[PDB]
Amino acid sequence: LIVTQTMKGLDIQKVAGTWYSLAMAASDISLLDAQSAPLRVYVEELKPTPEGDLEILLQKWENGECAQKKIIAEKTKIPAVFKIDALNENKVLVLDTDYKKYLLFCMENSAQSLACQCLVRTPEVDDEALEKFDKALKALPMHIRLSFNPTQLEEQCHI
Amino acid sequence: LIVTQTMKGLDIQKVAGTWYSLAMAASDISLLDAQSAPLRVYVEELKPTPEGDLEILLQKWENGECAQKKIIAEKTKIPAVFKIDALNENKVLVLDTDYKKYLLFCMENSAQSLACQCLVRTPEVDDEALEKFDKALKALPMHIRLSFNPTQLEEQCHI
Ligand SMILES: CCCCNc1ccc(C(=O)OCCN(C)C)cc1
Ligand SMILES: CCCCNc1ccc(C(=O)OCCN(C)C)cc1
Numbered sequence A, B: 001l002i003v004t005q006t007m008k009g010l011d012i013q014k015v016a017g018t019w020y021s022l023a024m025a026a027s028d029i030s031l032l033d034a035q036s037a038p039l040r041v042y043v044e045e046l047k048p049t050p051e052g053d054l055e056i057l058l059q060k061w062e063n064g065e066c067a068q069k070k071i072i073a074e075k076t077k078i079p080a081v082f083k084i085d086a087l088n089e090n091k092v093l094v095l096d097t098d099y100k101k102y103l104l105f106c107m108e109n110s111a112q113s114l115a116c117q118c119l120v121r122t123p124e125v126d127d128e129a130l131e132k133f134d135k136a137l138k139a140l141p142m143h144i145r146l147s148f149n150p151t152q153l154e155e156q157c158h159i
Helices: A127-139 B127-139
Strands: A020-026 A041-048 A054-061 A066-075 A081-084 A090-097 A102-109 A114-120 A144-147 B020-026 B041-048 B054-061 B066-075 B081-084 B090-097 B102-109 B114-120 B144-147
Touching: A020 A041, A020 A127, A090 A127, A102 A127, A114 A127, B020 B041, B020 B127, B090 B127, B102 B127, B114 B127
Parallel strands: none
Antiparallel strands: A020 A114, A020 A144, A041 A054, A054 A066, A066 A081, A081 A090, A090 A102, A102 A114, A144 B144, B020 B114, B020 B144, B041 B054, B054 B066, B066 B081, B081 B090, B090 B102, B102 B114
16 A cells, blocks of 8 residues: 555466566665665566465575575455565565566555565566666655666576 | 766866765665665765865765765866776766756766766755756666665765
8 A cells, every 4th residue: 555556457377487586676775785685585486376376486695695485475355466474464566567578566564665576587688677667666765776687687696 | 988978067166065965876786785885975075175176075884884084086177077096097977966956976987887876965855856867877777776865864874
């Protein structure tokens, strides 16, 4: 209920597969500043379950190393909106996707912390996907933005 | 010779005084990511010498603490262009300023490392100064952008 762009007509099954975290942004610098910042997460693959939950594979820098992680985001009554079981509840929103090239999502908590990423299908700089991302962000109050080049995208934890 | 926007008609004497580093961007993430990143520098005051050199007072996080620093940027034959005596030579460029509200500058080295800041006169979020900054940046290949809120701007090293 900060983010108010969601994608109409979302077919979750078609976001399945390989993704690249091409750009990220967050509402506070410390959500992304360091390599082990809480929301510095690199997406690897999306696996929707037949029941419509979303399994997420990614990487994080945690213990001085690049570690694998698996998250499950459970479906809500809103197709573009999912829920992650954390200590405090955390909504995931799909803002926009064309399935075959890019996907924009944000994660936020119910009571002013927010992070969004531009996911792309391949290790290339997609200018217009980043345009769509920047348009979606201009509303939101972001204070850090990160972008990765094709070299880093082919590296674990984008080193 | 990456940055090709400079300000025509620059009167260096009139940038004198109090500035706030409202936003920064850099060509590589590690130039700004951590609190002690090499180019995470917060500008405090500009002091042009009568001879047209530029003294710069600022703060940096260095030794686990917010430390004062003084730099002098020496004039060149180009009024919007200055030079800092480092190990390797480092050009400072004034892209644009209206003297009384904002100033945009970049620093770069002669052989693909680059950082730019939006300096403002007061601890307020100046939307159009940030617009001008974002327009100036769209050309350049930046990969990290940081923005500070009025609270942090009134704090040493923007904590
Ligand atoms: C279309 C859905 C893409 C969403 N991908 C996501 C990626 C990461 C997260 C997420 O919550 O990661 C941060 C928590 N880590 C540190 C345990 C949540 C969703
Ligand atoms: C209009 C001129 C404003 C320029 N202000 C500047 C601020 C900082 C620097 C600069 O070089 O700072 C980084 C080097 N530190 C870590 C020793 C260079 C110029």
